[PDB]
Amino acid sequence: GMTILSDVKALGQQIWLDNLSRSLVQSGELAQMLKQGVCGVTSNPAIFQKAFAGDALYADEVAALKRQNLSPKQRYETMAVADVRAACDVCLAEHESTGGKTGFVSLEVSPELAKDAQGTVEEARRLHAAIARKNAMIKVPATDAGIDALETLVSDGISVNLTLLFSRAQTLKAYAAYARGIAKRLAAGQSVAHIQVVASFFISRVDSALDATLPDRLKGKTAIALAKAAYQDWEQYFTAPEFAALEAQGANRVQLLWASTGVKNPAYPDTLYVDSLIGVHTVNTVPDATLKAFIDHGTAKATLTESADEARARLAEIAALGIDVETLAARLQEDGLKQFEEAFEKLLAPLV
């Protein structure tokens, strides 16, 4: 039942909604969610493509924007920034109730910038200013250029959702870039206590890529095992003396966020990823149908750290089979960028 959302918050995990639309906000639905255990919102270009195509409240906005001399991208941004700013206002009470530790809304930069660090910084700074809300995160793909940009954006005081992570190695690189940006602010006497970063580590895509060719005992297991191992890495990194020295001065830890947590194989229970990945100081962003399913028949238990030995043994067998999870992660990140760019191009065409 609905109280499962509060039970998960007591276990130290925030549940966010991986969807956004003009009607979700305007109808009052988002505000009602924020009073009843949803703690944040994520978007991406596919989410906006579907919202713009299906939500009747965009029609008049598009008609208005087509009367102006604006590029398709500008029309999209005017729409999306307005939705994000409105959602930020809905989430502000929650955000301020935790001292700025919850209640975030994420907006992603253009996919075509993913391998351009300077262009990413420029767009992220601009979108941060355009939204004009303390509880907005700019979503940036975790390519090498994105990790370069992360360091700069953190040093600028901007909260960031680093997305399309599938790799423990790339995640650790992100933590190091974050720490460098925080250290640069502390050295300059600037505040750090309101800078928040999430590392959005994608789940279902790993199982989708591997399961058809895995043995029986591994089908549907690899994504969860990787996530468990990533969380162990997180505990080690952020408790080390180097980070503790920053946290003592007000720095916030990055938090792992489980994304792509809708189940995509009907052979697995629809709450598998949410149920299996609950642990302290994490986030799980879920699509509507998965949120529904979790409220109806999910389970709130601290599962993320259970059976870490089995996760290690499974990852050793994945390697034994010749699956290089770092090679896989790069291909999945590439896949995901292509897919997001395809969605973005699909949403721009009706805005010409």
Q: Which residues face 69 on adjacent strands?
A: none
CA-based nearest residue to 155, from 181, 137, 174: 181
Give the C-alpha separation, 206 to 203, whole Å.
Answer: 6
**Measuring CA to CA, which residue among 152, 285, 277, 164 is closest to residue 227?**
277
Domains of the chain: 3-351 (3.20.20.70)
What is the experimental resolution, given in Å to one decimal place?
Answer: 1.0
Phi, psi (degrees; rounded to nearest 5) at 345: -60, -35
**What's the one-letter identity of residue 318?**
I
Report yes or no: 121 and 154 within 8 Å, Cβ to Cβ: no
Q: Which amino acid is at 304?
A: L
CA Rg, the chain, in Å? 20
The single-letter DSSP state of residue 218 is G
Residue owning tokens 């005992």? 217
Within the chain, residue ranges assigned H as helices are 4-10, 22-26, 29-34, 45-54, 58-65, 72-97, 117-131, 144-155, 168-187, 204-210, 222-239, 241-247, 272-276, 288-297, 308-320, 325-348
Q: Given 35, 50, 101, 139, which residue is catalytic?
A: 139
Rounded alpha-carbon distances, angstroms, from residue 219 to 28, 61, 175, 286, 312:
41, 46, 30, 22, 15
CA distance 210 to 216: 12
Residue appearing with tokens 């029986």: 216
> What CA–CA distance (Å, rounded) separates 81 from 89?
12
CA dihedral 154, 156, 158, 160 (to 10 degrees): -30
What is the 8-class DSSP label of residue 8? H
Say how far apart CA 100 and CA 193 lie, in whole Å: 9
Residue 142 near residue 211, CB atoms below 8 Å: no
Report which secondary-structure segment, H or E, holds 105. strand 104-108
Strand 255-259 with 136-141, pairing: unpaired
Cα–Cα distance between 150 and 121 in angstroms, integer? 8
Say how far apart CA 96 and CA 221 lie, in whole Å: 38
What is the C-alpha separation between 10 and 33, in angstroms, rounded? 17
Q: Alpha carbon of 143 to those of 114, 175, 229, 274: distances in Å?
A: 7, 13, 20, 26
| 139 catalytically annotated | yes
Kindly give, in sequence order, each residue whose CB lies less than 8 Å from that of residue 103, ignoring residues fewer than 6 positions away.
34, 39, 40, 91, 92, 93, 94, 95, 96, 97, 135
Provide the Cα torsion 81, 84, 90, 94; round to 10°: -130
Contacts 24+ apart (CB under 8 A), 292-301: 294/4, 294/15, 295/1, 295/2, 295/4, 295/5, 296/1, 297/271, 298/4, 298/271, 298/274, 299/4, 299/271, 299/275, 300/4, 300/7, 300/8, 300/11, 301/11, 301/275
Which residues are registered as beta bridge partners of 41?
Answer: 17, 105
Q: Which residues does a gap of C–N over 2.5 Å follow in the chain?
A: none
Nearest to 85 by CA among 48, 129, 34, 45: 129
Q: Is 192 helix (H, G, I), strand (E, B) or coil?
A: coil
